[PDB]
Amino acid sequence: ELLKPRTLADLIRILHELFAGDEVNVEEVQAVLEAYESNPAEWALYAKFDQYRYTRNLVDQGNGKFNLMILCWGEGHGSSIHDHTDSHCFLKLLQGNLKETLFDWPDKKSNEMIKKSERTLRENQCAYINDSIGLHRVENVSHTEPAVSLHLYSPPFDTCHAFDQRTGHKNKVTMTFHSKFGIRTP
Ligand code: NI
Protein backbone atom coordinates (compact mmCIF):
# COMPACT_ATOMS: atom_id res chain seq x y z
CA GLU A 1 0.00 0.00 0.00
CA LEU A 2 1.19 3.61 -0.52
CA LEU A 3 0.41 5.34 2.78
CA LYS A 4 0.47 9.06 3.55
CA PRO A 5 3.90 10.04 4.86
CA ARG A 6 3.47 11.40 8.41
CA THR A 7 6.80 13.22 8.45
CA LEU A 8 9.86 13.80 6.24
CA ALA A 9 11.58 10.80 7.86
CA ASP A 10 8.48 8.70 7.08
CA LEU A 11 8.53 9.92 3.47
CA ILE A 12 12.21 8.89 3.16
CA ARG A 13 11.34 5.41 4.58
CA ILE A 14 8.54 5.04 2.02
CA LEU A 15 10.85 6.19 -0.77
CA HIS A 16 13.40 3.57 0.10
CA GLU A 17 10.54 0.96 -0.27
CA LEU A 18 9.44 2.38 -3.65
CA PHE A 19 13.06 2.27 -5.01
CA ALA A 20 13.83 -1.22 -3.58
CA GLY A 21 13.66 -2.60 -7.13
CA ASP A 22 15.23 -1.69 -10.48
CA GLU A 23 12.35 0.24 -11.96
CA VAL A 24 10.36 3.29 -10.80
CA ASN A 25 6.62 3.74 -10.69
CA VAL A 26 6.62 7.44 -11.52
CA GLU A 27 3.00 8.07 -10.66
CA GLU A 28 3.30 6.37 -7.25
CA VAL A 29 6.47 8.32 -6.40
CA GLN A 30 4.82 11.60 -7.42
CA ALA A 31 1.70 10.81 -5.38
CA VAL A 32 3.67 9.99 -2.21
CA LEU A 33 5.81 13.15 -2.58
CA GLU A 34 2.68 15.25 -3.03
CA ALA A 35 0.99 13.54 -0.05
CA TYR A 36 3.73 14.62 2.42
CA GLU A 37 2.47 17.89 4.01
CA SER A 38 5.54 20.17 4.19
CA ASN A 39 6.48 20.78 7.83
CA PRO A 40 9.27 23.36 8.09
CA ALA A 41 10.56 22.07 11.46
CA GLU A 42 11.41 18.76 9.79
CA TRP A 43 13.52 20.24 6.99
CA ALA A 44 14.98 23.42 8.54
CA LEU A 45 18.32 21.59 8.97
CA TYR A 46 18.66 21.43 5.19
CA ALA A 47 17.32 24.88 4.29
CA LYS A 48 20.74 26.56 3.98
CA PHE A 49 20.51 29.55 1.71
CA ASP A 50 23.14 31.54 -0.19
CA GLN A 51 22.57 35.22 -0.91
CA TYR A 52 23.66 35.03 -4.55
CA ARG A 53 22.28 31.80 -6.06
CA TYR A 54 20.18 28.74 -5.21
CA THR A 55 21.79 25.97 -3.14
CA ARG A 56 21.54 22.14 -3.38
CA ASN A 57 21.42 20.34 -0.01
CA LEU A 58 21.69 16.55 -0.02
CA VAL A 59 19.24 14.87 2.36
CA ASP A 60 19.41 11.16 1.47
CA GLN A 61 21.46 8.99 -0.92
CA GLY A 62 18.77 6.49 -1.50
CA ASN A 63 20.97 3.41 -0.93
CA GLY A 64 22.39 4.39 -4.39
CA LYS A 65 19.10 4.33 -6.35
CA PHE A 66 18.27 8.03 -5.99
CA ASN A 67 19.52 11.36 -4.56
CA LEU A 68 16.95 13.25 -2.43
CA MET A 69 17.92 16.91 -1.91
CA ILE A 70 16.49 20.28 -0.86
CA LEU A 71 17.06 23.35 -3.04
CA CYS A 72 16.83 26.80 -1.48
CA TRP A 73 16.00 29.68 -3.83
CA GLY A 74 16.48 33.24 -2.61
CA GLU A 75 14.22 35.95 -4.03
CA GLY A 76 14.89 36.11 -7.76
CA HIS A 77 17.15 33.09 -7.89
CA GLY A 78 16.75 30.81 -10.91
CA SER A 79 18.35 27.95 -12.80
CA SER A 80 19.70 27.58 -16.32
CA ILE A 81 17.61 25.88 -18.99
CA HIS A 82 18.78 22.34 -18.33
CA ASP A 83 18.27 18.61 -18.92
CA HIS A 84 18.29 15.75 -16.41
CA THR A 85 20.91 13.28 -17.67
CA ASP A 86 18.55 10.43 -18.58
CA SER A 87 17.13 10.36 -15.02
CA HIS A 88 13.71 10.74 -13.50
CA CYS A 89 13.33 14.10 -11.73
CA PHE A 90 10.61 14.94 -9.19
CA LEU A 91 10.31 18.42 -7.73
CA LYS A 92 8.01 19.12 -4.76
CA LEU A 93 7.49 22.57 -3.31
CA LEU A 94 8.16 22.76 0.47
CA GLN A 95 7.79 26.57 0.73
CA GLY A 96 6.92 29.39 -1.65
CA ASN A 97 6.36 29.07 -5.37
CA LEU A 98 8.55 28.43 -8.42
CA LYS A 99 7.89 29.21 -12.08
CA GLU A 100 8.76 26.28 -14.40
CA THR A 101 9.33 27.12 -18.08
CA LEU A 102 9.33 24.18 -20.52
CA PHE A 103 11.48 24.06 -23.67
CA ASP A 104 11.84 21.56 -26.46
CA TRP A 105 15.22 20.04 -27.22
CA PRO A 106 17.05 22.41 -29.67
CA ASP A 107 17.65 21.49 -33.28
CA LYS A 108 21.13 21.69 -34.80
CA LYS A 109 20.71 25.18 -36.30
CA SER A 110 21.54 27.92 -33.82
CA ASN A 111 18.17 29.51 -33.07
CA GLU A 112 16.46 31.19 -30.20
CA MET A 113 14.88 28.61 -27.89
CA ILE A 114 11.20 29.53 -27.56
CA LYS A 115 9.29 28.43 -24.45
CA LYS A 116 6.72 25.73 -25.08
CA SER A 117 4.74 26.49 -21.91
CA GLU A 118 5.04 27.70 -18.34
CA ARG A 119 3.39 27.10 -15.03
CA THR A 120 3.53 28.13 -11.41
CA LEU A 121 4.32 25.26 -9.03
CA ARG A 122 2.79 25.94 -5.60
CA GLU A 123 3.41 24.76 -2.07
CA ASN A 124 3.16 21.00 -1.68
CA GLN A 125 2.67 20.31 -5.38
CA CYS A 126 5.00 17.74 -7.01
CA ALA A 127 6.05 18.11 -10.64
CA TYR A 128 7.91 15.55 -12.75
CA ILE A 129 10.24 15.84 -15.72
CA ASN A 130 12.55 13.66 -17.75
CA ASP A 131 14.55 14.16 -20.99
CA SER A 132 11.78 12.60 -23.11
CA ILE A 133 9.38 15.36 -21.89
CA GLY A 134 11.83 18.19 -22.66
CA LEU A 135 14.08 20.77 -20.92
CA HIS A 136 13.14 23.28 -18.25
CA ARG A 137 14.19 26.36 -16.34
CA VAL A 138 12.94 26.75 -12.72
CA GLU A 139 12.93 30.26 -11.15
CA ASN A 140 11.88 31.88 -7.92
CA VAL A 141 10.40 35.02 -9.46
CA SER A 142 9.25 36.31 -6.07
CA HIS A 143 10.71 39.59 -4.78
CA THR A 144 9.71 38.81 -1.16
CA GLU A 145 9.47 35.05 -0.44
CA PRO A 146 12.31 32.48 -0.56
CA ALA A 147 11.24 29.13 -2.03
CA VAL A 148 12.37 25.69 -0.84
CA SER A 149 11.91 22.59 -2.98
CA LEU A 150 12.50 18.86 -2.45
CA HIS A 151 14.00 17.10 -5.49
CA LEU A 152 14.41 13.33 -6.11
CA TYR A 153 16.54 12.15 -9.06
CA SER A 154 16.81 8.53 -10.06
CA PRO A 155 19.41 7.34 -10.94
CA PRO A 156 21.51 9.93 -9.09
CA PHE A 157 23.51 12.28 -11.34
CA ASP A 158 25.97 15.02 -10.67
CA THR A 159 26.49 16.42 -14.17
CA CYS A 160 23.98 17.90 -16.67
CA HIS A 161 23.83 20.45 -19.50
CA ALA A 162 22.84 24.07 -19.48
CA PHE A 163 21.44 25.49 -22.68
CA ASP A 164 21.88 29.02 -24.10
CA GLN A 165 18.39 30.35 -24.72
CA ARG A 166 19.67 32.48 -27.62
CA THR A 167 21.30 29.64 -29.62
CA GLY A 168 20.37 26.28 -28.12
CA HIS A 169 24.07 25.58 -27.54
CA LYS A 170 24.70 23.46 -24.48
CA ASN A 171 27.58 23.10 -22.06
CA LYS A 172 28.27 20.41 -19.51
CA VAL A 173 28.01 21.53 -15.91
CA THR A 174 29.10 19.71 -12.72
CA MET A 175 26.79 20.26 -9.91
CA THR A 176 28.04 20.48 -6.39
CA PHE A 177 26.32 20.15 -3.01
CA HIS A 178 26.16 23.18 -0.72
CA SER A 179 25.62 20.76 2.19
CA LYS A 180 25.21 17.01 2.86
CA PHE A 181 23.15 15.59 5.75
CA GLY A 182 22.84 19.04 7.31
CA ILE A 183 26.63 19.72 7.13
CA ARG A 184 27.95 22.61 5.02
CA THR A 185 30.43 21.20 2.47
CA PRO A 186 32.53 24.10 1.15
NI1 NI B 1 15.50 20.52 -13.35
UniProtKB/Swiss-Prot annotation:
Enumerate the UniProt keywords alphabetically: Dioxygenase, Iron, Metal-binding, Oxidoreductase, Thioether bond
Check the record and name the InterPro entries matching this protein. CDO_1, RmlC-like_jellyroll, RmlC_Cupin_sf
Give the top-level enzyme category.
Answer: oxidoreductase
- Tissue expression, per UniProt? Highest expression in liver. Also expressed in kidney, lung, brain and small intestine.
Q: In which pathway does it act?
A: Organosulfur biosynthesis; taurine biosynthesis; hypotaurine from L-cysteine: step 1/2
Q: Which cofactor does it need?
A: Fe(2+); Ni(2+); Zn(2+)
Task: List ligand-binding residues for Fe cation.
Answer: H82, H84, H136
- What does the record say about how the cofactor binds? Binds 1 Fe(2+) cation per subunit. Ni(2+) and Zn(2+) can be used to a lesser extent.
Q: How is it modified after translation?
A: The thioether cross-link between Cys-89 and Tyr-153 plays a structural role through stabilizing the Fe(2+) ion, and prevents the production of highly damaging free hydroxyl radicals by holding the oxygen radical via hydroxyl hydrogen.
What is this enzyme's EC? 1.13.11.20
CDD domains, alphabetized: cupin_CDO
Cross-link 3'-(S-cysteinyl)-tyrosine (Cys-Tyr) position reads C89-Y153
- Catalyzes what? L-cysteine + O2 = 3-sulfino-L-alanine + H(+)
According to its record, what are the GO cellular component terms? cytosol; plasma membrane
Q: Which GO terms describe its molecular function?
A: cysteine dioxygenase activity; ferrous iron binding; nickel cation binding; zinc ion binding
Q: What biological process terms from GO does the record include? A: L-cysteine catabolic process to taurine; lactation; response to amino acid; response to azide; response to cAMP; response to ethanol; response to glucagon; response to glucocorticoid
Q: Which Pfam families match?
A: CDO_I (PF05995)
Q: What is the protein's known function? A: Catalyzes the oxidation of cysteine to cysteine sulfinic acid with addition of molecular dioxygen.
- What family, per the record? Belongs to the cysteine dioxygenase family.
What quaternary structure, including any partners, is listed in this protein's UniProt entry?
Answer: Monomer.
Listed PANTHER family: CYSTEINE DIOXYGENASE, CYSTEINE DIOXYGENASE TYPE 1
Name of the protein this chain belongs to? Cysteine dioxygenase type 1
Taxonomic placement: Eukaryota, Metazoa, Chordata, Craniata, Vertebrata
